[PDB]
Amino acid sequence: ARPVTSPGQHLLAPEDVVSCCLDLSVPSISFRINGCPVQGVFESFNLDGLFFPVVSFSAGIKVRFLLGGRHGEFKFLPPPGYAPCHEAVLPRERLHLQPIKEYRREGPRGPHLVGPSRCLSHLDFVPCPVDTIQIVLPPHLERIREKLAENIHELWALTRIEQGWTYGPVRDDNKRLHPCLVNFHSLPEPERNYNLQMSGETLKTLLALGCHVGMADEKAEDNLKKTKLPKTYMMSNGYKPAPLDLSHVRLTPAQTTLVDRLAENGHNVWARDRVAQGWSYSAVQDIPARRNPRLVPYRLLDEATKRSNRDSLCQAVRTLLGYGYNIEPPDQEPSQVDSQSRGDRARIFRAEKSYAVQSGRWYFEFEAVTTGEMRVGWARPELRPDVELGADDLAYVFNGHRGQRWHLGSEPFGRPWQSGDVVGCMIDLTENTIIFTLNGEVLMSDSGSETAFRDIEIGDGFLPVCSLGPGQVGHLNLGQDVSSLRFFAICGLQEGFEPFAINMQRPVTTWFSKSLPQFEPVPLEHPHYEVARMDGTVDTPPCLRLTHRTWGSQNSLVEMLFLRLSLPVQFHQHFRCTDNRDDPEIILNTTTYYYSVRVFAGQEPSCVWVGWVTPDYHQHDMSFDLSKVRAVTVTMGDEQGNVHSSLKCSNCYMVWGGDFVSPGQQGRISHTDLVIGCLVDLATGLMTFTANGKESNTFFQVEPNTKLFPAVFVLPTHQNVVQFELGKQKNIMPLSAAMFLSERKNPAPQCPPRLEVQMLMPVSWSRMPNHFLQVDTRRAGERLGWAVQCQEPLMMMALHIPEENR
Amino acid sequence: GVQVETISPGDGRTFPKRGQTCVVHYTGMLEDGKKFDSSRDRNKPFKFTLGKQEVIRGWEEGVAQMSVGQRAKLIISSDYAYGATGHPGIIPPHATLVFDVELLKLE
Amino acid sequence: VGEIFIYWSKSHNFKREEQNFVVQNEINNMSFLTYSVQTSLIVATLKKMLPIGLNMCAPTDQDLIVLAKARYALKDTDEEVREFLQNNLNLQGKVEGSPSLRWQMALYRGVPGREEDADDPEKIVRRVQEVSAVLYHLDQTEHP
Amino acid sequence: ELLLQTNLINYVTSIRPNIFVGRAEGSTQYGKWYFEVMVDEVAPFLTA
Ligand SMILES: Nc1ncnc2c1ncn2[C@@H]1O[C@H](COP(=O)(O)OP(=O)(O)OP(=O)(O)O)[C@@H](O)[C@H]1O
């Protein structure tokens, strides 16, 4: 938190109007309190995502979003050029207030568990049509090239007049005057050329997508009938549209899919052209300002517009098919989405370990509000959070999207559910079996067995577990309120199964697989990574060396690896104002500390980043590079500018081994280690680096009290990757001297047991709070905006790990 | 030391006078940002009389610089605080203290 | 169906003819459900209908079913079991005895129609007798 | 700095309108946006 000057400063109080301005060009975020400027700005921040307005709060507030238009009348005028945020609602969306990345919700008969939310990307607004320039029309297609040029325009005018659009001198949608309803050949030159180009472009795109076309009729092709449009369809100027008339054709499903693809391509081409001309999207049309409600990539477009475009393209395809051209749909190219990591994607909710049952007959229910990828069943207490349910031997579950039973793999079982279906999961530890019922009816395997799993080893016990994929919603009923169960009496009650939480005074606690990456000690049994604690010899300092166990073999795992050291170095509270043997006075008065990383020969320096991270680093980026690092400049000045301070804030301070690899050595594998040294002055906030003794040009400046963890990000390219060398340099203290108080004056390098290598893990178990804030979001009015209210307090006892600032 | 930074305004007229009893709520943090004391956790306002040297110098001056109903932040240096000795077990030696004080009333 | 199952369990010729019929005619028992006494429709049909019967018995009766099972293990007749239950009615398990019986009773009384059941002693002894006999013979069969 | 520290804290939650804006080469989205928040009620200390 950085104090920011503003007239009449005061912590936000009733009747305060905060005004937030986002300028993505600079980029910059600026504020205005009650119309007065706030002398401070965020800027130069990462732009790899979508920005949204947000308000965070604890209980005891009432606030209202004013988004302009009919969604809250601004109390102050937006600064010149800024658009009201109500214009950014997508065509297929309705403006309303939301929670963010919720894993839990309320519902008619209890809480709903929610899987990950599928969100858009900033790149989803960049229309990407397929290249159609090199596609020169083969002779017959060139012959028909301009033939559609008239026909499509004729159909367009006819459709307009059928919906009531009657020619006029100018553009006036009220009286319905329109200038372009004139003979195509005499249509205004720009529009006529555009229509000619698109009439050819439909064929060009047909070829580009891979469609196969060839002439099939000549005399029947020539045979043409037009539409005798009456005076109602005749224009004010008298022009009569003359579109081609043919209804003797049918459409294949592949042809309909191709029509959809053609519509997508055409709309994306139009959107790209308008973006190049300088147009943008807006919920409210504004022609003078080059804002258009349809200027969005086809996929995000509204259903009605999709249907209209598809109708036009379908008519074109019908014309071609009637002419006989054998338009064989292109060979479909198989592909997947793989938008995310499947193992880490689905959110897993399990009962707490203390609830594990090692005997008896237990039953619980799982209603599937959606119909997607949801799994439900019984898991062992040592269930991992980063592995799919039932992919290992730690869970026996049922996936009712396609009707499979999962344990150490998949197998067909049961039938897929539908929205609202209740799966009753039963475990019998007297017979060591698991049963699944759907809407009260037992699910049978293909063979015909009633039990889903058999010969179940009890082990440590079993716990209710479910896994929801992105966009999925479930309802877990453990049976505390026996009357709430919907299909218990039908199946399970007489069989003698007892609701899992029948005699529990309080609701069962649950834990969910939080997908926030966290640094954890490298497992001592990790299949692929080994860390060796090498002792300090006479001519070598203490070291922690990483080696890839399974390098150069099948099953090897090669991917980005983010490592840090368990303990941080903390900069002093207040910064200073403004042979090869250490000199005792200098070494005992110095505040500079050093540590090196040795990248072993074979490990490409271009695949290693060395430096420091703060406690806030939470990126498991599989395609990491120094451009992905979070950064933001906070700049504060006076009323008339006069910048007073400009602080850069980040969570990763590193250098790239590619900066040090030399061009002569580039392109070939080197045979020498690369030693990158990192120096930090805990009394001045300055961080510098050296490579093979030579100094580097990179340097960072941090603020007092900052905590920095030694860190290394590497993509293993050799069985020996890197080595944290916790040594020293002439007149420079080792890391242990800064890390440990007892060693504050000891210049002998050390690697105590606490200092260890930790790696970033993408998923971890996290307890679900038993009570949640009751936030009321509604629409106060067309001028009052959208009201958020939270009046009931809610607290928790937090346990703080001092070194991790967590 | 003591620096006073307003958080919420007060009436701006009724200021403490010597011999009066200031009733406040406060939350004491070390300069690092670690909470070490808070009357709001005990849920009882802290009353202290000005001029009797009951509280440390930083309080004696900062609270005097405040107005009834005002919420302020007092940044107090070691000399205007427990100083070199500190508060054994609570406040380290030579520690700057940050307080979020609220002058509830005068009596 | 329970009476027919009891006849099947008692008489051994009936089982022999069942096994014959199924083997010779090559009837697909699994197909009917959707060679093996497990697939024998005589016992499978019972197992299917058994919850219908057990729904009659109030969970309080569970003790009386247990005792009737002991009688049938001692090889008594139906009248013997009926009189044994008649004079051992007071052994009725009390709901306060076990928390499980608490919620079982909650469900049983909450469901309409069962509020008037578990009232008349002759009805109680009957139901416990039939269900206990069926359960005993089912146990005998499932024992390999 | 050594013993785990405990303290009572307030739960905090965030609310947004479903409005998403970004920047990318060739994107169809405008670049400048503005909104406001009016504070009706605030209890400075509803808890400790
Ligand atoms: N929203 C859209 N989606 C897809 N294609 C479009 C869209 N808007 C325009 N086009 C393309 O541009 C053509 C515009 O129609 P036409 O050129 O006959 O009339 P215009 O009067 O010039 O256009 P407009 O009615 O948009 O002012 C459409 O036939 C289609 O080829």
CSV table of C-alpha atoms in Angstrom, one decimal, chain A residues 15 121 136 202 255 347 487 512 564 716:
chain,number,residue,atom,x,y,z
A,15,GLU,CA,-21.3,9.4,-0.2
A,121,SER,CA,-8.7,-14.6,-23.5
A,136,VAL,CA,-6.7,-18.1,-57.8
A,202,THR,CA,-17.0,-17.2,-51.1
A,255,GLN,CA,-22.6,-29.1,-46.2
A,347,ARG,CA,-11.6,-29.3,-9.2
A,487,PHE,CA,-33.4,-41.9,-3.6
A,512,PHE,CA,-10.8,-28.8,-2.5
A,564,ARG,CA,13.7,-21.8,-4.9
A,716,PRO,CA,16.1,-29.7,-18.1
